[PDB]
Curated annotation (Swiss-Prot):
The keyword Zinc does not apply. It is an enzyme of class 2 (transferase). It holds the Pfam family ATP-gua_Ptrans. Approximate repeats lie at residues 2-358, 359-696. Keywords: ATP-binding, Kinase, Nucleotide-binding, Repeat, Transferase. Substrate binds at G69, V70, G71, V72, Y73, E230, C276. One of its GO terms (biological process) is phosphocreatine biosynthetic process. Belongs to the ATP:guanido phosphotransferase family. It catalyses: L-arginine + ATP = N(omega)-phospho-L-arginine + ADP + H(+). The keyword Flavoprotein does not apply. It comes from Anthopleura japonica (Sea anemone). This is Arginine kinase. CDD domains: eukaryotic_phosphagen_kinases.
Length: 696
């Protein structure tokens, strides 16, 4: 249960049977204990491979580490035959029901896999990963490879890897000579490996550490190679989402190229040769993270697992399971992936059946009297019945839209739109909620957008900042051509991030700045952002239930200008949250800067917009202008003045408190007035508040 190398060495130096295998501490499930019998030991203790590999070399880790599951490593290919009486038994046990006599067939042609993307909307599956172990022709395996040959392997591999093009293009980092900065980065990406543990140590695998070891990854960070760790190659293809077809394609592309140029250790009986016999055959571990708490309780759950030879283990994450293959010998890589795909699909269809069933009925929780959401107010059972089966082109149902209000009974609204079509297809519900929250606006009135700052007449109110401390204007926007945030697929969100960053990086003048993706953000970048109050985090339970938090934090990021007067959040609650900000009183300048930035983005990308709703948002509260204009101002005199109420009411502004009696003055309306009108209203209102605070 800890390594005892000193005790093993006594027996090894005498070439005697390892007595500690008969030690009560030893794992009674140890394969080396089970099959290294005194007679097996006697028969094989004097044999050596061409590389000088002995039986003791092979069994050493299993004696040093008595808690071992397997407990042997092969120093070379010859070890599997010369020490066959040991390895054969171990293999056929671990890999049962596989029989070496049956033989193994490899298949790394991704075109043999039929895998249409299971879950692009990411309703169930969270991530997909495929890993294979390989060793190069012409060398011993990792426990027996010579110092010179490990270096030759690294060199040959790197030559192929750095030749890779397209999405496989990337960079190699040798462990030897790696600086602290790089080490930190690779840890942050979880790409780093360190000196092997007690098991690899005792196997002889750690020799010459860290010479000849290295890490390669593509620029997308969806392809990773560990070089000369436990095997010559550990090759991993991975990404968020469900697209195992694309993951396996990328894997195959790289592996076949290496195979072509270099060649792999491989036999009919064993498949690909690896250091540990657990990794023979396909040498593959395929893994999908999927949320299936309902399918788990189904009586056909274990039957599906058994049928496809997969296993389900536990991994915010309730109901999430790691589905993985149990088998590597007797099925091809193609077959493993297809079983993985078919198996997860069957498990997913179970979850979907359970959910469609529960969604087939009016949400009983809404019947409760003390629930006061607009959802409850307007969602009658007849309305529910007339709409519950209709779906948008992007696959959004009514229940998708109302889910957050059903899961969060204490919501105010409780309805999110997954896409533009929701506002039309589920209009009998959405119209009522829009006109309630945005009262007195009527959708029949329609909305006029206006982002021309020259139509605002705003001579600077308080140049000294005596009363007005800061001025802020934010707009929410969503990019035309996509779902809204709650309905986004993985690829849409990534496309949005890519195109927005593109526009933002092209911004010149006082709008020039830098982007900070959340994915792979370091401690110091974060801290810096927190200090400026620029950082955002994963959405709350309302956003979580609305489907807004999917694949967090992929596709999410932060941009700000050098002056820190311009800030953009990407794919937070809306696809775009755009903020212009200043100390002092100059609303015209803040709005002028905002318009310059928003209009440029509009021209390049386009926004989601209708005549009736103005700019579209997943949250109906952010429709129209999607604007929040904010002025921080010290107004003790006028807050007590009796024209105060009249002023706030005429100009549709409201004051809330916050260093002094600084009040936040913000706009009350978003639909029925243009951005220009909103800013002009704010200017006019604040002007009158100032005239009272300044009278003598």
């Amino acid at each position: 249960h800890m390594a005892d190398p000193e005790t093993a060495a006594k027996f090894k130096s005498k070439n005697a049977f390892p007595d500690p295998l008969n030690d009560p501490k030893c794992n009674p499930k140890s394969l080396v204990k089970k099959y290294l019998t005194p007679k097996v030991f006697e028969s094989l203790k004097n044999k050596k491979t061409k590389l000088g590999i002995t039986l003791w070399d092979c069994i050493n880790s299993g004696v040093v580490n008595l808690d071992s599951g397997v407990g042997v490593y092969a120093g070379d290919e010859e070890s599997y035959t010369l020490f066959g009486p040991l390895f054969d038994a171990i293999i056929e046990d671990y890999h049962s029901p596989y029989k070496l006599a049956t033989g193994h067939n490899s298949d790394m042609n991704p075109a043999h896999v039929k895998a249409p993307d299971l879950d692009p909307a990411n309703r169930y599956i969270r991530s997909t990963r495929i890993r294979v172990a390989r060793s190069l022709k012409g060398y011993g395996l990792a426990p027996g490879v010579t110092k010179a040959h490990r270096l030759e392997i690294e060199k040959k591999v790197v030559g192929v890897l750095t030749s890779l093009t397209g999405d496989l293009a990337g960079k190699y980092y040798p462990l030897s000579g790696m600086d602290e900065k790089t080490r930190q980065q690779l840890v942050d990406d979880h790409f780093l490996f360190k000196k092997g543990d007690r098991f690899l140590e005792a196997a002889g695998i750690n020799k010459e550490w860290p010479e000849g070891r290295g890490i390669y990854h593509n620029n997308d960070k969806t392809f990773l190679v560990w070089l000369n760790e436990e095997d010559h190659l550990r090759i991993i293809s991975m990404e968020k989402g469900s697209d195992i077809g694309s993951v396996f394609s990328r894997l195959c592309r790289a592996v076949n190229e290496i195979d072509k140029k270099l060649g792999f250790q491989h036999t009919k009986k064993h498949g690909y040769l690896t250091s540990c016999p657990s990794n023979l055959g396909t040498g593959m571990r395929a893994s999908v993270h999927v949320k299936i708490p309902h399918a788990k309780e189904h009586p056909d759950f274990e039957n599906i697992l058994t049928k496809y030879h997969i296993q389900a283990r536990g991994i915010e994450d309730a109901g999430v399971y790691d589905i993985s293959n149990r088998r590597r010998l007797g099925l091809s890589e193609v077959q493993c992936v297809q079983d993985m795909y078919d198996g997860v699909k069957a498990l997913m269809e179970l979850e979907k059946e359970a959910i469609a069933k529960k969604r087939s009925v009016f949400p009983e929780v809404l019947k409760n009297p003390e629930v006061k959401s607009l959802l409850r107010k307007y969602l009658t059972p007849e309305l529910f019945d007339s709409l519950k089966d209709k779906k948008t082109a992007k696959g959004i149902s009514l229940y998708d839209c109302i889910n957050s209000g059903v899961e969060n009974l204490d919501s105010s609204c409780g309805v999110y739109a997954g896409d533009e079509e929701c506002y039309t297809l589920f209009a009998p519900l959405f119209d009522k909620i829009v006109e309630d929250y945005h009262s007195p606006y009527k959708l029949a009135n329609k909305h006029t957008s206006d982002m021309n700052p020259e139509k605002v007449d705003a001579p600077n109110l308080d140049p000294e900042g005596t009363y007005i401390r800061s001025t802020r204007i934010r707009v929410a926007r969503n990019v035309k051509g996509y779902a809204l945030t709650p309905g986004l697929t993985r690829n849409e969100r990534l496309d949005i991030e890519r195109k927005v960053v593109g526009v933002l990086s092209s911004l010149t003048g006082d709008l020039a700045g830098q982007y900070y993706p959340l994915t792979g953000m370091d401690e110091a970048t974060r801290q810096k952002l927190v200090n400026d109050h620029f950082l955002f985090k994963k959405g709350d339970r309302f956003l979580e239930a609305a489907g807004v938090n999917k694949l967090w934090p992929e596709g999410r990021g932060i941009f700000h200008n050098n002056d820190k007067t311009f800030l953009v959040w990407i794919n937070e609650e809306d696809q775009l949250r755009i903020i212009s900000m200043e100390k002092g009183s100059d609303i015209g300048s803040v709005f002028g800067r905002l318009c310059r930035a928003v209009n440029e983005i509009d021209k390049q990308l386009g926004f989601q917009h209708t005549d009736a709703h103005g700019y579209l948002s997943g949250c109906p509260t952010n429709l129209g202008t999607g604007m929040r204009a904010s002025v921080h101002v010290k107004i003790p005199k006028a807050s007590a003045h009796p024209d105060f109420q009249k002023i706030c009411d005429e100009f549709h502004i409201q004051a809330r408190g916050i260093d002094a009696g600084v009040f936040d003055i913000s706009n009350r309306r978003r639909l029925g007035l243009s951005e220009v009108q909103c800013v002009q209203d704010m200017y006019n209102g604040v002007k009158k508040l100032l005239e009272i605070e300044k009278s003598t």
